[PDB]
Ligand SMILES: CC1=C(c2ccc(O)cc2)[C@H](c2ccc(OCCN3CC[C@H](C)C3)cc2)Oc2cc(O)ccc21
């Protein structure tokens with residue numbers, strides 16, 4: 524029932540905070556410590572992501588089961604687009620945190636990492652060339668949340684999918700509204716809409732390559748479990 | 761040059777450039793290697809894909825080097841969307857060839873295959889649900905060709921062609937009688953399906969690699985030879 528303006532306002536209000544890496548001026552940054560710091564940040568960002576997701580219009584209208592499925596599908600894509608967004612104004616660097624700004628040479632320290640760094644930096648550059656606006660960014664991130672898991676899900680399921688498609692349609696309306704307000708021609712509007720949504724194909728690509736890379740590290744866990752996501756999502760009262 | 765085409769001229773060019781549907785190489789008199797059949801078919805399909813790519817307006821304006829890199833990035837996605845397209849009118853089945861229609865039970869035959877089968881089937885179902893038209897299909901396939909490798913003067917040209925295809929898609933929908941709102945909603949719906957096709961190609965590549973076959977990706981030299989400089 525939201526208007527385009529109401530949709531933008533809700534998404535902007537729902538934005539999670541930018542988190543920091545730990546501070547210590549007695550411990551100089553080490554290559555050996557890098558993955559540990561990144562993991563610690565990612566895990567903390569995930570908790571805020573679940574909060575954010577619950578504030579995306581239409582998301583909590585879904586079953587808890589399907590909310591979990593959508594986050595299972597989208598969580599790394601969402602981490603990545605978030606990273607690319609806060610890195611946009613910093614050519615050649617990834618702003619994992621304001622006190623953890625890394626370049627591709629530092630990425631070389633971890634086997635297989637520089638390939639993923641390069642893809643993320645390329646996305647940052649693309650954002651920059653398009654002059655991506657914050658209002659557009661929060662629309663794109665919401666689209667990832669709703670769309671990424673919708674092809675891999677009963678009567679209830681059909682109802683859910685119809686709802687997701689209607690919300691996705693409203694976000695399309697919202698993007699078009701924003702561009703119309705920016706003074707773009709109708710032609711420029713459709714063209715930019717297309718340009719923006721094609722970036723999501725690259726973000727999906729990066730998530731899949733990234734997931735493969737994280738698994739190759741043979742750590743205890745990579746993905747947040749169904750259990751964990753449910754626990755974070757399945758709040759009482 | 762090819763950017764000077766009208767929307768109608770663009771559509772006609774793409775429709776005319778469509779590759780043929782090939783047959784599986786087996787003797788139908790004999791008892792029914794699935795991956796063997798599929799690999800043989802994919803490899804033959806690839807040749808026709810390269811000749812199709814050369815007819816996508818704007819593609820051959822790129823350097824041969826860049827043409828090859830786009831094909832390197834896009835070939836599996838393009839195989840997949842073509843498979844989904846010809847499987848649309850066959851619910852629950854994948855029409856790999858007219859003489860090779862497989863259902864998901866058949867897919868189980870091969871380890872790790874049914875997961876990718878189900879994704880392909882879901883895409884075919886989505887196409888049918890959206891009543892995807894042939895004119896839209898050829899635009900989407902062209903977008904995959906130009907977009908899949910663009911992150912890995914030339915880039916400006918690629919974006920110009922992509923913008924032209926967007927114009928063409930919107931033109932088709934307007935002609936179909938859709939309102940402006942329906943036009944940009946349907947455009948978005950179609951482009952979001954492309955992210956799923958990318959996903960499928962990613963998981964498909966993982967699966968093909970896990971089989972530890974001889975090769976998986978076509979070499980630079982193979983693609984370049986097919987391009988016939
Ligand atoms: C994009 C990205 C990272 C990354 C690094 C390599 C790679 O192949 C894919 C993602 C790494 C990264 C990403 C995900 C990681 O998963 C650790 C396992 N956690 C994830 C959630 C679950 C509770 C367990 C560990 C490190 O760092 C980031 C931190 C952020 O706050 C936001 C994005 C990242």
Ligand SMILES: CC1=C(c2ccc(O)cc2)[C@H](c2ccc(OCCN3CC[C@H](C)C3)cc2)Oc2cc(O)ccc21
Pocket residue numbers: 795798799801802803805806839840843856873876963964965967968975976977978979
């Ligand atoms: C989608 C698809 C196939 C497939 C099966 C499992 C999988 O994990 C990914 C793709 C299999 C398939 C797809 C690609 C294959 O690559 C074999 C290696 N070739 C590819 C080109 C290069 C010259 C070497 C082998 C089998 O069959 C198809 C045949 C088609 O004419 C069109 C699409 C396919």
